[PDB]
Design an enzyme around this catalytic site. Structure first.
Site, PDB file in Angstrom:
ATOM      1  N   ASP A  77      -1.886   5.012  -2.539  1.00 50.65           N
ATOM      2  CA  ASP A  77      -1.277   4.214  -3.613  1.00 50.65           C
ATOM      3  C   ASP A  77      -0.010   3.472  -3.128  1.00 50.65           C
ATOM      4  OD1 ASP A  77       0.818   6.126  -3.708  1.00 50.65           O
ATOM      5  OD2 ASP A  77       0.163   7.042  -5.579  1.00 50.65           O
TER       6      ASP A  77
HETATM    7  P1  LIG Z   1       1.578  -1.230  -5.274  1.00 47.87           P
HETATM    8  O1  LIG Z   1       0.721  -1.725  -6.451  1.00 47.87           O
HETATM    9  O2  LIG Z   1       2.985  -1.861  -5.357  1.00 47.87           O
HETATM   10  O3  LIG Z   1       0.928  -1.681  -3.946  1.00 47.87           O
HETATM   11  C1  LIG Z   1      -0.373  -1.367  -3.464  1.00 47.87           C
HETATM   12  C2  LIG Z   1      -0.669  -2.140  -2.157  1.00 47.87           C
HETATM   13  C3  LIG Z   1      -0.130  -3.573  -2.302  1.00 47.87           C
HETATM   14  C4  LIG Z   1      -2.195  -2.197  -1.999  1.00 47.87           C
HETATM   15  C5  LIG Z   1      -0.038  -1.444  -0.921  1.00 47.87           C
HETATM   16  O4  LIG Z   1      -0.598  -0.134  -0.792  1.00 47.87           O
HETATM   17  C6  LIG Z   1      -0.356  -2.269   0.345  1.00 47.87           C
HETATM   18  O5  LIG Z   1       0.067  -3.424   0.459  1.00 47.87           O
HETATM   19  N1  LIG Z   1      -1.091  -1.680   1.294  1.00 47.87           N
HETATM   20  C7  LIG Z   1      -1.479  -2.341   2.544  1.00 47.87           C
HETATM   21  C8  LIG Z   1      -2.123  -1.439   3.609  1.00 47.87           C
HETATM   22  C9  LIG Z   1      -1.233  -0.324   4.138  1.00 47.87           C
HETATM   23  O6  LIG Z   1      -1.163   0.755   3.556  1.00 47.87           O
HETATM   24  N2  LIG Z   1      -0.571  -0.637   5.257  1.00 47.87           N
HETATM   25  C10 LIG Z   1       0.365   0.191   6.038  1.00 47.87           C
HETATM   26  C11 LIG Z   1      -0.375   1.097   7.026  1.00 47.87           C
HETATM   27  S1  LIG Z   1       0.590   2.144   8.197  1.00 47.87           S
HETATM   28  C12 LIG Z   1       1.433   0.913   9.207  1.00 47.87           C
HETATM   29  O7  LIG Z   1       1.250  -0.264   8.995  1.00 47.87           O
HETATM   30  C13 LIG Z   1       2.372   1.351  10.326  1.00 47.87           C
HETATM   31  C14 LIG Z   1       1.736   1.278  11.717  1.00 47.87           C
HETATM   32  C15 LIG Z   1       2.768   1.566  12.823  1.00 47.87           C
HETATM   33  C16 LIG Z   1       4.144   0.935  12.550  1.00 47.87           C
HETATM   34  C17 LIG Z   1       5.177   1.276  13.626  1.00 47.87           C
HETATM   35  C18 LIG Z   1       5.065   2.716  14.087  1.00 47.87           C
HETATM   36 ZN   LIG Z   2       1.324   8.479  -5.623  1.00 47.01          ZN
END
Ligand SMILES: *P(=O)(O)OCC(C)(C)[C@@H](O)C(=O)NCCC(=O)NCCSC(=O)CCCCCC
Ligand SMILES: [Zn+2]
Ligand code: NA
Ligand SMILES: [Zn+2]
Ligand SMILES: [Zn+2]
Ligand SMILES: [Zn+2]
Ligand SMILES: [Zn+2]
Ligand SMILES: [Zn+2]
Ligand SMILES: [Zn+2]
Length: 77
Positions: free
Chosen positions: A35
């Site tokens: 989430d």
């Molecule tokens: P809410 O309704 O505000 O938001 C929900 C969303 C917009 C779907 C978010 O959960 C979102 O934008 N998710 C995108 C995908 C995600 O979870 N990305 C992050 C993954 S982990 C990462 O990117 C780090 C990798 C290494 C970084 C340096 C160590």
């Molecule tokens: Zn939660």
């Protein structure tokens, strides 16, 4: 242990999902049920473990387990 094993472990722990479920192709949101807060907390956990800051706009596009492993292999120092 490998970066793959260490990244998968952190994801499982952060998302509260069992290890056999964290596959390289799994979508954090669509498959692992993440989430909004989970997203923030996951990114910060990985930034700490691998000592590297990822721009928020960039983290937003990392949607799969494999994408995270790749970023880390490409940026940790
Ligand atoms: P809410 O309704 O505000 O938001 C929900 C969303 C917009 C779907 C978010 O959960 C979102 O934008 N998710 C995108 C995908 C995600 O979870 N990305 C992050 C993954 S982990 C990462 O990117 C780090 C990798 C290494 C970084 C340096 C160590
Ligand atoms: Zn939660
Ligand atoms: Na090792
Ligand atoms: Zn091993
Ligand atoms: Zn599950
Ligand atoms: Zn520390
Ligand atoms: Zn951030
Ligand atoms: Zn954005
Ligand atoms: Zn280092």
């Amino acid at each position: 242990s490998t970066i793959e094993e260490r990244v998968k472990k952190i994801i499982g722990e952060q998302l509260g999902v069992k290890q056999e479920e964290v596959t390289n192709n799994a979508s954090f949101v669509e498959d692992l049920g993440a989430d909004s807060l989970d997203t923030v907390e996951l990114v910060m956990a990985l930034e700490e473990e691998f000592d590297t800051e990822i721009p928020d706009e960039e983290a937003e596009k990392i949607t799969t387990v494999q994408a995270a492993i790749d970023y880390i292999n490409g940026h940790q120092a």
